Design a protein around this ligand. Structure first.
Ligand SMILES: CCCCCc1cc(OC)c(CC=C(C)C)c(O)c1C(=O)O
Length: 264
């Protein structure tokens, strides 16, 4: 037995998953198949040092660390665009006060970036350039200060987050829950946001119970990961303050600039 209330939650889950696939070109399922070797055709070129970097750099001038960081900032900008497209599909989102929509995106995009970045990670590195490349965790750690530390907390989070074994259908709802957070600073009308999140939370809970019936309290464990994300973002923003002051010759994309502007 499942009922009409639960039926509407399944319809919501379906809609979100559909929109997620439409918005995010490289899904977790694709990322895993690339990372696991379901493959003679999907094998990534692996960047693990300077030469391999130079070699890989014909499928994608200045210092290596800056090239990587700026490559990372550019992909973040693209992720922001994809996440914004996805957000508009969340029912109710575009009906919210325009200021609140902006606020939700402002505080939500980075937490989603790191959630979804985990899909592209294992303990040994991260998929890059639409999955055509793989950059090792050790290579990123070897970068001159203050870059050698920029990806470490993301990997640390990914390894733990990935142990939840969520699939894209789960993630579609979870990232919707993240965006529709009524606790964001400066929100004008919290109640309409809370009402949407409540329904998302309901959809998320049913989704995890059906998809992961033997994974006890998965719902609670997932919600607790919010803390980790919030912390990654805080550290990232701090590191960015360091970069701005040490690398005055390194331009930061304005979209990212505005998101970081007076954040937490
Ligand atoms: C000389 C550029 C090397 C790749 C830069 C890069 C770096 C990078 O950080 C290691 C990432 C993933 C990171 C985020 C989405 C934050 C990337 O997706 C990419 C990319 O797609 O090009």
């Amino acid at each position: 037995q499942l009922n009409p209330e639960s039926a509407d939650l399944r319809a919501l889950a379906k809609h979100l998953y559909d929109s997620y696939i439409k918005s995010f070109p490289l899904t977790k399922a694709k990322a895993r198949a690339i990372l696991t070797g379901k493959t003679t055709d999907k094998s990534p070129f692996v960047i693990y040092d300077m030469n391999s970097l130079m070699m890989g750099e014909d499928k994608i001038s200045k210092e290596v660390a800056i090239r990587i960081f700026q490559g990372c900032q550019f992909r973040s900008v693209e992720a922001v665009q994809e996440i914004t497209e996805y957000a508009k599909s969340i029912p109710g989102f575009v009906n919210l006060d325009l200021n609140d929509q902006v606020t939700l995106l402002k505080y939500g995009v980075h937490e989603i970036i790191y959630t979804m970045l985990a899909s592209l990670m294992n303990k040994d590195g991260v998929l890059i350039s639409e999955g055509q490349g793989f950059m090792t965790r050790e290579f990123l750690k070897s970068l001159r200060k203050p870059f050698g530390d920029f990806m470490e907390p993301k990997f640390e989070f990914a390894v733990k987050f990935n142990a939840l074994e969520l699939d894209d259908s789960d993630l579609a709802i979870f990232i919707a829950v993240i965006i529709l957070s009524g606790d964001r600073p400066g929100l004008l009308n919290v109640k309409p946001i809370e009402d949407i999140q409540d329904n998302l939370l309901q959809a998320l809970e049913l989704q995890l119970k059906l998809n992961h019936p033997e994974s006890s309290q998965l719902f609670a464990k997932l919600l607790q990961k919010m803390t980790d994300l919030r912390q990654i973002v805080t550290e990232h923003v701090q590191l960015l303050q360091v970069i701005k002051k040490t690398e005055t010759d390194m331009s930061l994309h304005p979209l990212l600039q505005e998101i970081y502007k007076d954040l937490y």
